[PDB]
Amino acid sequence: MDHLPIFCQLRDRDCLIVGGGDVAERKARLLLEAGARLTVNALTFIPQFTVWANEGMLTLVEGPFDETLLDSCWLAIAATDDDTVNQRVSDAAESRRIFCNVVDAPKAASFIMPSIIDRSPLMVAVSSGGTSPVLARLLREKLESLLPQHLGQVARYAGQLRARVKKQFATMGERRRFWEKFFVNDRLAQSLANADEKAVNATTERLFSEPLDHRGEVVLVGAGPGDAGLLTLKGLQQIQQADIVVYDRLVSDDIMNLVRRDADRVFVGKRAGYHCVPQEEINQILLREAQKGKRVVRLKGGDPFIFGRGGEELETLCHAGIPFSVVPGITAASGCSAYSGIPLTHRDYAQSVRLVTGHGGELDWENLAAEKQTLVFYMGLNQAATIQEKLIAFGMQADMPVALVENGTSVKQRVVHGVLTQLGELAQQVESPALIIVGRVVALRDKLNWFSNH
């Protein structure tokens, strides 16, 4: 151990920062967030320092380094770009035993300022010990995605339950399992952040009212079009806490490897081409397994409420009193749009975007063939030619640009394009899953293409 990490209480405690540029400002933002009684000493200050000074957040001392400024300080930071002046601040700080950070050089002075993950009162800090700040950022990034946003809410709330926990749970092992369940309860954390007193109570009691080993709930999660990177942070957090993951084929492999490892997996997808699971049964197992006290995650391709009906898999939960929630995901329209260089909206081209089903009651042609609009078809490859003919017939121009995006956002993403009179033809050049994009925005791809094609 080359450094001893410690967590300092800075509320209304004197601290000094020497410097007034951009580096000093970050140091001040941080110190202020911690509530320090801050004095900033520099030759010149950037605007944000004037803004704070003018709303009582800190004190400014314009001029060179005044050593007496350290006489009652608990922390000092050298943040000027003059190595000799920083040296004097450090020396003046060390002579009076004041922890000081020289910020240009990390191991020259008293303490290192680590990369922080703030979930107050819960906090994590990572340090390179001065070797690699790059590594520190890599860790902060990974740690931020793993700690839910409102984790601090439950850390703070735990206090108002400690007594009740010791009273119903008399064995240390039991009380620990309680906290393990309590600390991953994201719905409660959200309710507290929303100041939803009834749900906070409703969710607090279900925590004491249900069997200890039960964590019944259903979470609909949008996996995104394929790229594991397009999963949302909450979606990852939910996926790492699942007891059972119910998924279909449009959920990527990379996405599934992020699942927790012997968290049971239930493939409700269309097997070998011919065996798909009827919806009521998928609905029933989600309700059934949550009733058994399992944290159920329904992993859907793209987004849950856009042509992959989580609506159906949910209106049966809000009647068994099975708490539930929804984590939207990047829909194929958005993923493919961004990865093919085809904006769904651009300056003149259009400002009405339409997400339409492909192939009960069929297709409204001149609502479609009309324009100043961008058309995006989901599930329409076996109806591509039948879309071509029924679009030019109702007025759409034959030279209207079109494109097909297969396996959007994935390492095998294929993009093909041309003009409308080539649609059905370009479609027999692609396989499912793919989207069709009809619109003038398709020409923007010559200026915006950035992703590799296959």
Place this chain on the structure above:
Amino acid sequence: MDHLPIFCQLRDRDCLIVGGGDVAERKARLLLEAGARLTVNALTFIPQFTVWANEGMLTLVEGPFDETLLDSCWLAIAATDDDTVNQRVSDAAESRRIFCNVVDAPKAASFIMPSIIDRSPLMVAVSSGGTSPVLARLLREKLESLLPQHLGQVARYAGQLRARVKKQFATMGERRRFWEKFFVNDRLAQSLANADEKAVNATTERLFSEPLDHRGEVVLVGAGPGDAGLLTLKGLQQIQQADIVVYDRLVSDDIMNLVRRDADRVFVVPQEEINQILLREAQKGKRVVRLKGGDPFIFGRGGEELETLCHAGIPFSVVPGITAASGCSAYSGIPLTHRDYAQSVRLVTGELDWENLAAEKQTLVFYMGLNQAATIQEKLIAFGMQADMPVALVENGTSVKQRVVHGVLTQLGELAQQVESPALIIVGRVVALRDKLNWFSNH
């Protein structure tokens, strides 16, 4: 934050622990491993202290607490079994501006000792401030597993190559790329672990003898509607390692907090002026991130902000985000599509083509139309849309301050005054599903 974490260098710096029992011992163990010049003042002492005493790893002062033993110290730790002596210690520490910790009283004194996960020189610290000690112990376990054992080796080697890296690569980004390649090489990592200097040098030499790109870039990143957890993993990575971030007001502050604390930031300033800020900064060789609300290629001006970059020879890429239409609807318990309800969805702007928009077997979503709302219902109703059709206006979707108002067309213009921007307007049948599917707020 209620605490500020710092990593202190304790080598040759005096420290004081008052107390000499089991609690005092573990604390002394850390101070010693951190290399502090330690002094332990205690009425009685357990065996290990004596052991440390004759190897010369510390000094022992037998007897009651002496306030002057703090006069040369940088840190004071109170670990007696006497609540009264511990505060005499913290009052003596405080009067001398010496950070102090009282072990069984975390709400007191000036600093709390966090749980540590050691991978020297790499180190991670976790704490609750005493609010949820079980939470911090649970996190420590998980982190002990998540963090490879030999991570310190890679980190130690990274520091050693620092000097050569700078004197081989001229810019800021060939070195950023050097590191990205460095920390991704599993051969180099495995090689350090089995001290194979042949494999470490071989791989290292090829890293240095590589042609790395110096140019910067622009990366359009969707921040989503507001909720920070709706940002994508890649979106987080991009804002976590950017040089400068250009953001608008539709980027919630919780998301702005996820940005590199080391990056510069420009609030936004005409599209054309904004357009220039991007390529200019990329020109300098910087990694620019244009953080936009919702999704960049849907009613943002993402296309415009990129269409000249190719002409300029500036690398770019796009990271999609949850559009406001997807986030608000889902968070308001209104799915954009259901059973046979509507299988066609429209995202619109705030003349327009009302007959194509009042028609149905479709769902409508209006961005930017809170004050053109009266003309939408007057026009929609006129062009054929049934006035018992439910509508909804979502204010600050996905956020902790979200509000939802519902009703019917004939009230549209009215409800539009119950809310303010940023708000979204959902027209369609699926809005009736709100209370059969509502899950975020009772608001």
